[PDB]
Amino acid sequence: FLFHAVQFLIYTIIISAVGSIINYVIENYKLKFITPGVIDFICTSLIAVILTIKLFLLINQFEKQQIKKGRDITSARIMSRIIKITIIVVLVLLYGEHFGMSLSGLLTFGGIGGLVVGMAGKDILSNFFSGIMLYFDRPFSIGDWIRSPDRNIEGTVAEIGWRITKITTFDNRPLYVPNSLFSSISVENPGRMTNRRITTTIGLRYEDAAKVGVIVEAVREMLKNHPAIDQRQTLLVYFNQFADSSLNIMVYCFTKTTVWAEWLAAQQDVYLKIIDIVQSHGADFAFPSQTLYMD
Amino acid sequence: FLFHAVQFLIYTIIISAVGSIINYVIENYKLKFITPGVIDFICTSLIAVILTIKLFLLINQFEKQQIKKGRDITSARIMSRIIKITIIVVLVLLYGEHFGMSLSGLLTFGGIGGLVVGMAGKDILSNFFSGIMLYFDRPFSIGDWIRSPDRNIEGTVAEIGWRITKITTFDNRPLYVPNSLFSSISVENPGRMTNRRITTTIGLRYEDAAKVGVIVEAVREMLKNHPAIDQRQTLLVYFNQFADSSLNIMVYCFTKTTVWAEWLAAQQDVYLKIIDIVQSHGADFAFPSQTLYMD
Amino acid sequence: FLFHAVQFLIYTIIISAVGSIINYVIENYKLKFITPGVIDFICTSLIAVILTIKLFLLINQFEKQQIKKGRDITSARIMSRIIKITIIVVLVLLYGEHFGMSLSGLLTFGGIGGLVVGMAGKDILSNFFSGIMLYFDRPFSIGDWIRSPDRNIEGTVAEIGWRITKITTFDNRPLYVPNSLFSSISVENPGRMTNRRITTTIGLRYEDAAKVGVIVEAVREMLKNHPAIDQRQTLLVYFNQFADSSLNIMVYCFTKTTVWAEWLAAQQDVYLKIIDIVQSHGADFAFPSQTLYMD
Amino acid sequence: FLFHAVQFLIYTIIISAVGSIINYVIENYKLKFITPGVIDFICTSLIAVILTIKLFLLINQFEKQQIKKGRDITSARIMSRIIKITIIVVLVLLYGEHFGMSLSGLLTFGGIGGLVVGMAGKDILSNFFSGIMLYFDRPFSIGDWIRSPDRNIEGTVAEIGWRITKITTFDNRPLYVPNSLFSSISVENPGRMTNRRITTTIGLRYEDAAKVGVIVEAVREMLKNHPAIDQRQTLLVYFNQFADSSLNIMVYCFTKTTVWAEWLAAQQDVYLKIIDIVQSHGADFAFPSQTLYMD
Amino acid sequence: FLFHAVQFLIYTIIISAVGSIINYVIENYKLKFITPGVIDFICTSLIAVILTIKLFLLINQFEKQQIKKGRDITSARIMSRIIKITIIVVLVLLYGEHFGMSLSGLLTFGGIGGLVVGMAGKDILSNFFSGIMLYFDRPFSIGDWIRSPDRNIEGTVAEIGWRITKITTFDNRPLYVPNSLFSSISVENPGRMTNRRITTTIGLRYEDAAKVGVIVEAVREMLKNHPAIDQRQTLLVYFNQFADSSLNIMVYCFTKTTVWAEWLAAQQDVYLKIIDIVQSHGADFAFPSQTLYMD
Amino acid sequence: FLFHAVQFLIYTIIISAVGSIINYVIENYKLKFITPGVIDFICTSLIAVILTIKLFLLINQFEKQQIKKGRDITSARIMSRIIKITIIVVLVLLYGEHFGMSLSGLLTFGGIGGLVVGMAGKDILSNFFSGIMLYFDRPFSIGDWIRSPDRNIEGTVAEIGWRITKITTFDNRPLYVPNSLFSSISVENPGRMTNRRITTTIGLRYEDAAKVGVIVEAVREMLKNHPAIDQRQTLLVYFNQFADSSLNIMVYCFTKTTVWAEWLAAQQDVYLKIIDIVQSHGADFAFPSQTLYMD
């Protein structure tokens, strides 16, 4: 690593200095058939060979700590093959000036190779960049319950990584969401809610119309006196729908608490009180109804 | 920052002046083995080293105020690694002329690298640009209730940022909408409405046809005398549908007010008056009906 | 292979040395009509011919071990034709400097050829790159049961390859999933679950309201004493819905075990106990209900 | 073909040698108004004319064996027109150096022409490349029954081609699937299945609860003694659902055989045994049920 | 056309020869203020003017046979305007060397113009290329009945063109399908079917179980003796489904013929025989059934 | 326009001739501090200023006939601003050689500007190109009734334009269809139909099976003797479906006429005859049926 790199740099600097001194001597004294370009190319090739050997040393070392944690020899050998071919291709690209062919044909080849690699690896790059963005600006935090109206990502955030985010679903299963999704969908954060909402519909029989009015008032009064209902939020109780078999009354309010169990307990208490109020005034709930004409 | 930049610029200007003076002297007096290109390259390398050291100083400082607010050492160290590799890659690109390799191979490499970075980071850039556009021209304002027929973004706008917009839903939950969505979907603004609309259907029995006409007139007359109904807007009451089990009469009007509770109260009053009118004329509402042929 | 490559390299090095010596001699002694560029072009053409012959030897050998495992002669011959035309096209591109035509027209031709090959082969490249990514970072492992809310990939992972992943479905059928899908969809891993979830709904008759309260308590008490229920997880039993023909009570709990058969046995035991509790208090489950008005 | 190509190459080599000899003579003896560039351009034009004539000969011959198999004269003539215009366009591109116009304007024209041809013919190229990939790595084989959860490609594979794959559907109709689809969808291979699956649901009346337990045991015992059921696979019989009008018992097992007729026969035998077991214990299957409240 | 082109070429060749002779004379004798580049530019401009006049002659002629078949003067005049502006733009691009401006700015302008024309006209080019592909390799033929599971293209093929394919629907209406669709969808060819398929379901009452077995045998025996049923294909008759109100028996076979009327006649005969067999054994078909619990 | 262009060209030609004469004089006689490049740049700048003034004159004139037809001053002024900035940007691009900056930086700037304009204006260009294609090859004509199975474009074609096509719907409303849609969807042309189709289903009671056969024959005979039915087309009457509550008989035929009213009259006559035939044989049509099991 740094030691080998420093050694290679020192060797290269020394070889370059020696070549420059040799060129200066060939300038001073009879150079004969010299071609200083050829001497410089040989010097570069020596540097190129040293760099290639150093790189292959790291390739072998990398293969070693790849195998020692598993990664059976087939897969590790294949991966080493891939990245050594990548290294040699990069080396061929970089120095086509010293001894390589037409610079312009190499331009075309390297350009279209990099360009196809450009389209191919777009998704991984987008995931990495969205991970960086989430590092700098994220709408949630670890432990927050989140959901989206576009995709199914519901659950509590467990970990945030460079490529994927780990979320614990509500059936105790891990879910791995690619980071790029957080750059194009709307993310809702119920974990930062302020109140829980109670919404329901009371369906009365069509023969209870004369009672509807007073019933509404009764329900509203109860909601104004319940100790678990937030009085500074919206509180609506009105008759607003002609259903097929019933007259519908909306109920719309909020609870002071955000805890799941307390909200459910308050909802159950409100529902039981509503049943008592409706049955006290002589009305009743309506089943689906029909009119039958027999032959 | 500005102080370090000024110091580096002064040092660079002085080194360049010294190199120019040395080149002029080598022109005047015997230059010997000079290679003024080499002296200039050494001078640039010194400037390059100074710039690299200055940049790394800022990298370290940035890492420091990243850690002091949290951002555990692993993540901060990784981020510093990323941006220092980015800086060194930029430096390698910029000065491949002084000592770098083939300018044209470096062209290919830098070009395809920037081009893949181009496809990868399109979403973040689009969000930033749409944020700028919303800064200059936005259809809503903070506190406005908005919705869209294409996506689910309903709620009152809370904050407008550079990347995302924060909207408060109607169950008191925050929602984070990417800015780019506001460049391709239709945004409706109910917060700037002028009237609320009352629409309903009266379904009468098929044996009430002889009454339908007069009933319609009655309803229309009531809507023309209600103090909560805007008389300068549309007001339609007509029989316009043969339903499966009923004859349907449309009711279509507007209220003067836009407040939620007042609109609901007016709607309830209108519905109760409609029930009274229908039952006063001897007609009745129709349940779903069927004809049964028994064996 | 390596032997033939070494022989060709040695031959090329020797030919180049001979050509350089000949050019030096033509410099020293009367060169006559020489055109050293032409001699070098002839030398390169000889090297080009040798390289082409060597490549065609490998093409033929490859065709041989393609046929010996099957791959009837038509298909193998066609494939050899394709890759030999590819090789000759590459050779024509590389050395258009020595005797080829306008370097710039060849630039255009090679560039647009590589660019169309770029769009065409994007999917295979993306699959290969996602295979590499799965090699380095994968959310699952061999033998894990996985599923996705976006696509149908449910089953237990059997093999992970360079292009596709083999998954065993639950009807004992192999399924081959392209690797690129794992870069854009959310992958859920039920094989790493911690608990199994029991969720159900108890629908009581509308005449059982006076009992609902006590019934809920009874059920909750039973769930607090069942030896197969995890007491450190969520445990909710509340009345929370006015259904069309019934009052709905939710039941929400977790089991200690994750085995399929044990979870099903515990679920059956809980259901039977629930039936006994409901029938013991005088209530009953509700069928779909209706009200009929006869003529 | 090869003979004409060899003749043209020999003629071109001879013309080039003659032109070089003429240039050498013009160098030696008084060249007068020579412009050796013009002589070389004339020589190339002669070579260009010979190449064009040779190409047109092949164009005509190709038209001939196109017509002799049909392909009425209109279509064949049109196709010959297309590929001869393509050939002349290629010739104009290649040698704009000898007498053509600005090399750079020709760069622009050839580049954008090839680039539009690049977008236009992407689908055919992708089909060809996916055909090559299927040649090297395919998940199925000829005669295998395959299907996909993404598209409708169900049937037994009949032929694999360079562009499309021919599949025989189960109503004895050919289906032609483009090869590129096999690079982006999940392919399931029921032809390589190991067992067939038997899954069903037993719906009992709500008054049969006291029997449910014993009934389940009976069914399970039968499945443990059936000679056609694989005992090493999954075998589940549990009561796991409160349906609207019934209590549901799941049955989940596998058969030893994979043949269609034998699997169906075993399924029928199991179903008849299940009916006998259910009716023997005094229970019965449940029709959809309802509760009617008459006026 | 060819005559005018030959005349223009002869004139251009003569002008070029005259200019070359004039340049040679100016070389031999005192050229004075000559600027041979200017004389050559004037000569080219004369050639350019001649070419422009010749092109405009064809533009006018084309307008003439456009109008003589209709194409009212407005549309024809507009089209002539478009293609003459295209011709002059091409001429401006081609010779910006002789007197045009910066070659590199013209590079940028021509390049981005051609590139936008590249994205814009992709669909027409794709249709043309798919037409060529269909010419070389098509899955159907004129007169074949085809359909697709992806799009609605059902009908018998009538004509195959360069851009669209004309198909006669089964209500005697023409349908024009773009050719590019045949490069990305699966095409099924019922016109090349081998057998027609008979599939049906027999739903028996739940009280007919004791008969089900024998009934199945009877039906199978009949299908084995029907002279219109192919005995070498699949023939399956089994009880395989517990329906809501019935027990379902599958029937699955093939006919020897592929003619529409004969297949329908055989199907009707089979259905009538099935009815007779079912009613002969004492069973009966099942209507939808329900259980009613009255108050 | 042409007059101003001719005047400007004459002025430019004269200025260029004067500059050339001045350069020749400076060559002949003592030029002193001349810098002929500077004199030529001044001459070009004068030409540039004249061209800019001429262009601005047309800009103003265009603004004038824009306002005189309406187009209130704000919009017209804005549009003039846009196209004058476009003109000046084009002028800056074209002549960066005479006095502009680095040609290569201007290359980058002009290239990316044109390239973004390339992506942005793709839709308008595609509409224009599809309009040209429809001019040359269109599947319909003015007055034809067309429809598509992919989009809703049903109606009779009224006008064909360069960007959009105007179609009259069947409720007498104009519809404007972008031209590009006609390049990617299947267009059906009912206006060029040859026959109208009569298709229906006769549902008989399950107790009418003994009659089904003869009934079918009767219906077929009637269809063979109806004077409004085309006897050379398809004519099918068969029993082909076991429905839930009925036995289904298909009727499939064609009428000789294509007029709407005559086709409807023939259909009504056929339906009445079918009713008479069915009721004459003792059968009857079937209502939806059910079997009820009372407690």
PDB file of C-alpha atoms in Angstrom, chain E residues 66 71 75-76 79 82 101-102 104-106 108 112 115-117 119-121 123-124 127 151-152 162-163 169-178 181 200 260-261 264-265 267-268 271-272 275 285 287-294, chain F residues 93-95 97 103 107 110-111 114-115 118 122 125-126 128-129 133 135-137 139 149-150 182-190 192-195 197 206 233 236 238-242 244 250 252 254 289-295:
ATOM      1  CA  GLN E  66     -47.472  16.846 -56.277  1.00  0.00           C
ATOM      2  CA  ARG E  71     -52.640  18.169 -52.730  1.00  0.00           C
ATOM      3  CA  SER E  75     -49.911  22.170 -48.691  1.00  0.00           C
ATOM      4  CA  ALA E  76     -47.731  21.525 -51.747  1.00  0.00           C
ATOM      5  CA  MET E  79     -43.829  21.174 -48.468  1.00  0.00           C
ATOM      6  CA  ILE E  82     -39.656  22.857 -46.214  1.00  0.00           C
ATOM      7  CA  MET E 101     -17.232  31.000 -40.849  1.00  0.00           C
ATOM      8  CA  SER E 102     -15.443  29.214 -38.075  1.00  0.00           C
ATOM      9  CA  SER E 104     -15.824  24.686 -35.223  1.00  0.00           C
ATOM     10  CA  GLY E 105     -18.876  26.844 -34.543  1.00  0.00           C
ATOM     11  CA  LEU E 106     -20.420  25.319 -37.655  1.00  0.00           C
ATOM     12  CA  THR E 108     -21.484  22.794 -33.021  1.00  0.00           C
ATOM     13  CA  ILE E 112     -26.863  19.891 -32.362  1.00  0.00           C
ATOM     14  CA  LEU E 115     -28.915  15.593 -32.911  1.00  0.00           C
ATOM     15  CA  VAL E 116     -32.320  17.162 -32.210  1.00  0.00           C
ATOM     16  CA  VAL E 117     -33.494  15.812 -35.571  1.00  0.00           C
ATOM     17  CA  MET E 119     -34.423  12.414 -31.163  1.00  0.00           C
ATOM     18  CA  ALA E 120     -37.418  13.848 -33.008  1.00  0.00           C
ATOM     19  CA  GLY E 121     -37.660  11.354 -35.867  1.00  0.00           C
ATOM     20  CA  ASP E 123     -40.465   6.644 -34.322  1.00  0.00           C
ATOM     21  CA  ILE E 124     -40.648   6.874 -38.124  1.00  0.00           C
ATOM     22  CA  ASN E 127     -41.167   1.776 -38.116  1.00  0.00           C
ATOM     23  CA  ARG E 151     -52.088  -5.479 -27.633  1.00  0.00           C
ATOM     24  CA  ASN E 152     -55.319  -5.741 -29.624  1.00  0.00           C
ATOM     25  CA  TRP E 162     -42.905  -0.346 -45.163  1.00  0.00           C
ATOM     26  CA  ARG E 163     -44.472   1.592 -42.263  1.00  0.00           C
ATOM     27  CA  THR E 169     -60.712  -7.494 -38.210  1.00  0.00           C
ATOM     28  CA  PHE E 170     -63.523  -9.973 -37.650  1.00  0.00           C
ATOM     29  CA  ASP E 171     -66.199  -7.285 -38.058  1.00  0.00           C
ATOM     30  CA  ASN E 172     -64.865  -6.448 -41.551  1.00  0.00           C
ATOM     31  CA  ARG E 173     -62.980  -3.283 -40.596  1.00  0.00           C
ATOM     32  CA  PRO E 174     -59.404  -2.377 -41.594  1.00  0.00           C
ATOM     33  CA  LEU E 175     -56.829  -1.926 -38.836  1.00  0.00           C
ATOM     34  CA  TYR E 176     -53.424  -0.310 -39.340  1.00  0.00           C
ATOM     35  CA  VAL E 177     -50.709  -1.564 -36.980  1.00  0.00           C
ATOM     36  CA  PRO E 178     -47.318   0.199 -36.843  1.00  0.00           C
ATOM     37  CA  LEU E 181     -44.945  -3.153 -32.436  1.00  0.00           C
ATOM     38  CA  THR E 200     -65.878 -27.138 -20.040  1.00  0.00           C
ATOM     39  CA  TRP E 260     -64.850 -23.155 -37.236  1.00  0.00           C
ATOM     40  CA  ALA E 261     -68.265 -24.598 -38.094  1.00  0.00           C
ATOM     41  CA  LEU E 264     -68.744 -25.758 -33.130  1.00  0.00           C
ATOM     42  CA  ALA E 265     -70.966 -28.618 -34.312  1.00  0.00           C
ATOM     43  CA  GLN E 267     -68.847 -29.042 -29.365  1.00  0.00           C
ATOM     44  CA  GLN E 268     -72.648 -28.853 -29.444  1.00  0.00           C
ATOM     45  CA  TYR E 271     -72.531 -30.859 -24.775  1.00  0.00           C
ATOM     46  CA  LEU E 272     -75.858 -32.522 -25.573  1.00  0.00           C
ATOM     47  CA  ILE E 275     -76.460 -33.395 -20.570  1.00  0.00           C
ATOM     48  CA  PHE E 285     -76.840 -29.372 -12.573  1.00  0.00           C
ATOM     49  CA  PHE E 287     -77.980 -23.330  -9.612  1.00  0.00           C
ATOM     50  CA  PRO E 288     -76.352 -20.835  -7.249  1.00  0.00           C
ATOM     51  CA  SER E 289     -77.535 -21.797  -3.783  1.00  0.00           C
ATOM     52  CA  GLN E 290     -78.004 -20.136  -0.412  1.00  0.00           C
ATOM     53  CA  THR E 291     -79.155 -20.919   3.122  1.00  0.00           C
ATOM     54  CA  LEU E 292     -81.623 -18.479   4.680  1.00  0.00           C
ATOM     55  CA  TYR E 293     -82.159 -18.080   8.433  1.00  0.00           C
ATOM     56  CA  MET E 294     -85.452 -16.319   9.081  1.00  0.00           C
TER      57      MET E 294
ATOM     58  CA  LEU F  93     -21.745  31.875 -31.558  1.00  0.00           C
ATOM     59  CA  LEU F  94     -21.059  32.339 -35.218  1.00  0.00           C
ATOM     60  CA  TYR F  95     -18.228  34.791 -35.075  1.00  0.00           C
ATOM     61  CA  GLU F  97     -13.263  33.558 -34.450  1.00  0.00           C
ATOM     62  CA  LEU F 103     -12.911  28.663 -29.772  1.00  0.00           C
ATOM     63  CA  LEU F 107     -17.567  24.956 -28.518  1.00  0.00           C
ATOM     64  CA  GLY F 110     -22.740  26.311 -27.707  1.00  0.00           C
ATOM     65  CA  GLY F 111     -22.779  22.526 -27.714  1.00  0.00           C
ATOM     66  CA  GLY F 114     -27.972  23.313 -28.243  1.00  0.00           C
ATOM     67  CA  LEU F 115     -28.046  19.912 -26.554  1.00  0.00           C
ATOM     68  CA  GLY F 118     -32.440  19.327 -28.040  1.00  0.00           C
ATOM     69  CA  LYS F 122     -38.464  16.999 -28.670  1.00  0.00           C
ATOM     70  CA  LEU F 125     -40.462  18.420 -33.350  1.00  0.00           C
ATOM     71  CA  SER F 126     -42.012  14.949 -33.186  1.00  0.00           C
ATOM     72  CA  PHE F 128     -44.173  18.353 -36.813  1.00  0.00           C
ATOM     73  CA  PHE F 129     -42.425  15.289 -38.266  1.00  0.00           C
ATOM     74  CA  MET F 133     -45.484  11.760 -42.453  1.00  0.00           C
ATOM     75  CA  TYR F 135     -48.992  14.352 -45.384  1.00  0.00           C
ATOM     76  CA  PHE F 136     -47.096  11.683 -47.309  1.00  0.00           C
ATOM     77  CA  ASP F 137     -48.738   8.526 -45.906  1.00  0.00           C
ATOM     78  CA  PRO F 139     -54.342   5.744 -43.132  1.00  0.00           C
ATOM     79  CA  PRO F 149     -58.119   0.449 -29.210  1.00  0.00           C
ATOM     80  CA  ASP F 150     -55.248   2.214 -27.384  1.00  0.00           C
ATOM     81  CA  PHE F 182     -50.587   8.388 -35.066  1.00  0.00           C
ATOM     82  CA  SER F 183     -47.020   7.025 -35.137  1.00  0.00           C
ATOM     83  CA  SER F 184     -47.349   4.616 -32.197  1.00  0.00           C
ATOM     84  CA  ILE F 185     -50.981   3.438 -31.847  1.00  0.00           C
ATOM     85  CA  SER F 186     -53.178   1.185 -33.954  1.00  0.00           C
ATOM     86  CA  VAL F 187     -55.781   3.137 -35.931  1.00  0.00           C
ATOM     87  CA  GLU F 188     -59.015   1.397 -36.892  1.00  0.00           C
ATOM     88  CA  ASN F 189     -61.147   2.811 -39.715  1.00  0.00           C
ATOM     89  CA  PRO F 190     -64.829   1.850 -39.373  1.00  0.00           C
ATOM     90  CA  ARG F 192     -64.186   1.939 -44.641  1.00  0.00           C
ATOM     91  CA  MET F 193     -66.125  -1.067 -43.340  1.00  0.00           C
ATOM     92  CA  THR F 194     -67.816  -3.487 -45.731  1.00  0.00           C
ATOM     93  CA  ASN F 195     -70.541  -5.055 -43.559  1.00  0.00           C
ATOM     94  CA  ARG F 197     -72.236  -7.425 -37.741  1.00  0.00           C
ATOM     95  CA  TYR F 206     -82.267 -25.541 -18.166  1.00  0.00           C
ATOM     96  CA  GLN F 233     -70.301 -14.031 -44.996  1.00  0.00           C
ATOM     97  CA  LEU F 236     -73.195 -19.295 -37.151  1.00  0.00           C
ATOM     98  CA  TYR F 238     -74.866 -23.035 -32.249  1.00  0.00           C
ATOM     99  CA  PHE F 239     -75.344 -23.948 -28.596  1.00  0.00           C
ATOM    100  CA  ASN F 240     -71.946 -23.378 -27.024  1.00  0.00           C
ATOM    101  CA  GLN F 241     -72.149 -22.410 -23.342  1.00  0.00           C
ATOM    102  CA  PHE F 242     -73.365 -23.691 -19.977  1.00  0.00           C
ATOM    103  CA  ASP F 244     -74.998 -20.151 -14.498  1.00  0.00           C
ATOM    104  CA  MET F 250     -74.731 -17.856 -30.132  1.00  0.00           C
ATOM    105  CA  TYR F 252     -73.402 -14.448 -35.499  1.00  0.00           C
ATOM    106  CA  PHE F 254     -73.651  -9.915 -41.162  1.00  0.00           C
ATOM    107  CA  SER F 289     -82.059 -18.142 -10.907  1.00  0.00           C
ATOM    108  CA  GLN F 290     -81.269 -19.379  -7.418  1.00  0.00           C
ATOM    109  CA  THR F 291     -82.039 -22.263  -5.069  1.00  0.00           C
ATOM    110  CA  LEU F 292     -83.036 -21.336  -1.516  1.00  0.00           C
ATOM    111  CA  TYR F 293     -82.744 -23.687   1.469  1.00  0.00           C
ATOM    112  CA  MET F 294     -84.907 -22.423   4.315  1.00  0.00           C
ATOM    113  CA  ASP F 295     -84.293 -23.342   7.950  1.00  0.00           C
TER     114      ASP F 295
END
